[PDB]
Design a binder for this molecule. Sequence first.
Ligand code: G4P
Ligand code: G4P
Ligand code: G4P
Ligand code: G4P
Ligand code: NA
Ligand code: NA
Ligand code: NA
Ligand code: NA
Ligand code: NA
Ligand code: NA
Ligand code: NA
Ligand code: NA
Lengths: 192, 194, 193, 194
Amino acid sequence: NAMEALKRKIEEEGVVLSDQVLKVDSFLNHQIDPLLMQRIGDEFASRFAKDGITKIVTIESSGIAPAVMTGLKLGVPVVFARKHKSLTLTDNLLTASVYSFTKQTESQIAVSGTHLSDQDHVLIIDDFLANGQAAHGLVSIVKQAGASIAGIGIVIEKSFQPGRDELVKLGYRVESLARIQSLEEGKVSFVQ
Amino acid sequence: SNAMEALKRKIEEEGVVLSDQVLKVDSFLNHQIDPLLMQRIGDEFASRFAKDGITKIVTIESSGIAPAVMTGLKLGVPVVFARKHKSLTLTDNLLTASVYSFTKQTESQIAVSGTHLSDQDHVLIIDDFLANGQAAHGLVSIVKQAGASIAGIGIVIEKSFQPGRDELVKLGYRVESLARIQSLEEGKVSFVQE
Amino acid sequence: SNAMEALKRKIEEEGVVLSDQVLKVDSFLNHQIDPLLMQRIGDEFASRFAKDGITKIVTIESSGIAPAVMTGLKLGVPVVFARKHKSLTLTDNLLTASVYSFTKQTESQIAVSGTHLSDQDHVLIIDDFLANGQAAHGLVSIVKQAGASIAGIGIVIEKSFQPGRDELVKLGYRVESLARIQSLEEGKVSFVQ
Amino acid sequence: NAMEALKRKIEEEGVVLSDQVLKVDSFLNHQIDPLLMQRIGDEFASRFAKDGITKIVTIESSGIAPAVMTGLKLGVPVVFARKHKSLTLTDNLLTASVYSFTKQTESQIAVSGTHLSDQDHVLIIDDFLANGQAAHGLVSIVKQAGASIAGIGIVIEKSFQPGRDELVKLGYRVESLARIQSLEEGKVSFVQEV
Ligand SMILES: Nc1nc2c(ncn2[C@@H]2O[C@H](COP(=O)(O)OP(=O)(O)O)[C@@H](OP(=O)(O)OP(=O)(O)O)[C@H]2O)c(=O)[nH]1
Ligand SMILES: Nc1nc2c(ncn2[C@@H]2O[C@H](COP(=O)(O)OP(=O)(O)O)[C@@H](OP(=O)(O)OP(=O)(O)O)[C@H]2O)c(=O)[nH]1
Ligand SMILES: Nc1nc2c(ncn2[C@@H]2O[C@H](COP(=O)(O)OP(=O)(O)O)[C@@H](OP(=O)(O)OP(=O)(O)O)[C@H]2O)c(=O)[nH]1
Ligand SMILES: Nc1nc2c(ncn2[C@@H]2O[C@H](COP(=O)(O)OP(=O)(O)O)[C@@H](OP(=O)(O)OP(=O)(O)O)[C@H]2O)c(=O)[nH]1
Ligand code: NA
Ligand code: NA
Ligand code: NA
Ligand code: NA
Ligand code: NA
Ligand code: NA
Ligand code: NA
Ligand code: NA
């Protein structure tokens, strides 16, 4: 299954930096493995195939590939939020502020309100879930449109960081394909 | 429909002309993505380069990623997207190129890690728009810096009245543009005569 | 004075010409509002349409609201203001229109709930400024989507050297502008005589 | 009177959407009943007729209509704060942050100090009072200008939410024309009157 394939790729090609950051630039965050992305998208679609999804929401840039493969299988469009000023993202903006615990800056992410309806049932897709600030921002943007959230699909979850618990506590269904329990001693340990 | 037909229909029906030089397609390419259209676009690119020995796709965040990934999926090759800003893990073996912005009137840097580009690679560059061509030239430079060859450049929407295409063709590169726009004057899209 | 002359004097005495083509009137129209002047403006609009069988006024947030509500008060009709952004309760039967900005070369969407526009409505559109006219075209479209008819368009300040007015008039719409500005060059406001 | 007319309108046309949301788009928040707005303004003016009001402060968009009718009766100007960048609100900006529980995100509202002096005795007018964050923002803006606050006039107050108590605790006179004790079980229940 996709989970096993992903876990294998992490153990084979991932590099643990400073027992804290998991570098997977060979297939997710810089180089993209399209076949693996398709398997990931088919797994997300499988979990939400009976939820009435109308639209997927993600955020540039690493989330786009898994989100688009998921939208392809479910047959729904994919909207990616913008982090920086863009040429054609100008008005009708739904925005949220994303605080970085790392560099200690608040930044703004934005989605055009014309692409989210009160009748939309949204699946949020993202590559990493760590502290979860962008995920909260996308939840806010979806709620600002009057739309409902079917759930949140995450490729890699760092389960020792509070992002997941924050979303689940608020009632959101979180579907993480790889759940990392620890990165200490320079190696990846998966949950259970 | 083939990819070109479906893309021209989407442009006609949903594209919005904002000026002589700007065509808004945020409903299916630049903010909302139509994944099925992207697959057809990727399959079309793969067909045109099916016999050319492609080993890797190179694109640039963010709008180029979706058409690039669909092309790599069909061809069965990896996809590398250059980054425009500093990122958490793009930290070593950096290949850099200066990209002049016409609005900002200054150069910004794009980067790819050489870890993912070999001198044995035969690269297909994929991007969403071709206008003044500065990003395309930067991606060409990065591929060359890696010692790799360039099979061609695949473009979803080309503005044929701007110099980007002619500059790449004059350098000898194969440019495959699925929608070629002759003009946006009068607030309407006019495609190159076929 | 009548409303037109009161408005022109206020423009001359408190308006500021920015970049020789933008008229700043934040002291009484676009940020601070002079309610008494607004009432006189509304009464004049009402006078010009007092025998067209107006059933409803349509405007757009935010600067159009005050003159529109004063017009609706005198004519005895409700006022509907279009929205430029998401609103908590704006969800049902939304009629939308695209508004292009020649100044910024961008496009935005405005919306009105169809629940508040009937095929039996005869609508007077009220707005604060008429320049390039794209918002006015958008409100016209929304009224037509509802099957209602347009009695005319009342404008507080018209920049007559810009094409908005001629576009609307060409299409047969009555445009009633209380202050018609012929020029803003030389940092002075010249009115159409 | 205006309170009776308002309660009737709420009873006849208000739609309860939730335990926390009352839809009144038919006369206050989208379609406006100007005559009712007049009644509301005259009532606000009556309650503050002897208090030396020099200016009304409100916030776009729903607050404008009741605020302007109030200023018309009292014979004073009305200033509406803005929530978004606008063409001519460019200098002497007095700003306040406003948090939304509904949104879980913050927002900025602004007034130009050119239209507020330390000579001003301000009546704040708004359409709804719920959690009260926008009201506190307007209070902050008026205090930033060195002006005094005569009180806060509210068309519809949800008394079961903490907005009113916070302002009363800070010493402000809050005059609410309709006070809703509960929206439970899809019905509007008003605060008991003796
Ligand atoms: N590779 C990797 N990335 C991590 C890891 N932990 C967090 N990130 C990424 O760093 C960015 C910030 O995430 P957080 O770490 O939760 O935010 P924080 O700075 O407030 O803690 C995100 O990138 P992004 O916004 O998704 O960037 P982009 O890739 O889309 O440009 C996220 O995906 C990790 O262990 N490995
Ligand atoms: N929608 C639209 N975009 C155009 C058009 N022409 C150029 N662009 C986009 O603008 C960006 C380049 O901006 P400039 O620095 O002014 O370069 P330019 O002179 O070639 O336009 C590119 O975005 P990018 O780097 O691809 O950004 P992103 O979309 O990946 O974030 C390119 O795709 C057009 O007609 N319509
Ligand atoms: N003060 C002033 N404003 C002008 C002038 N010309 C245009 N505007 C205003 O600028 C805003 C945007 O106009 P555009 O849609 O770009 O097209 P326009 O310039 O032809 O109006 C409109 O405000 P709006 O949507 O009504 O904004 P709001 O005030 O309701 O927030 C319009 O009223 C001018 O000379 N002076
Ligand atoms: N219809 C309705 N609206 C409510 C109710 N409670 C609060 N609001 C409105 O929702 C908007 C946002 O409120 P918030 O900033 O989230 O504060 P809140 O937590 O008290 O709602 C405000 O509109 P605003 O800024 O005045 O919006 P606008 O209408 O001026 O655009 C406020 O008037 C309610 O029960 N019914
Ligand atoms: Na991400
Ligand atoms: Na990431
Ligand atoms: Na691009
Ligand atoms: Na682009
Ligand atoms: Na206006
Ligand atoms: Na205006
Ligand atoms: Na309000
Ligand atoms: Na409100």
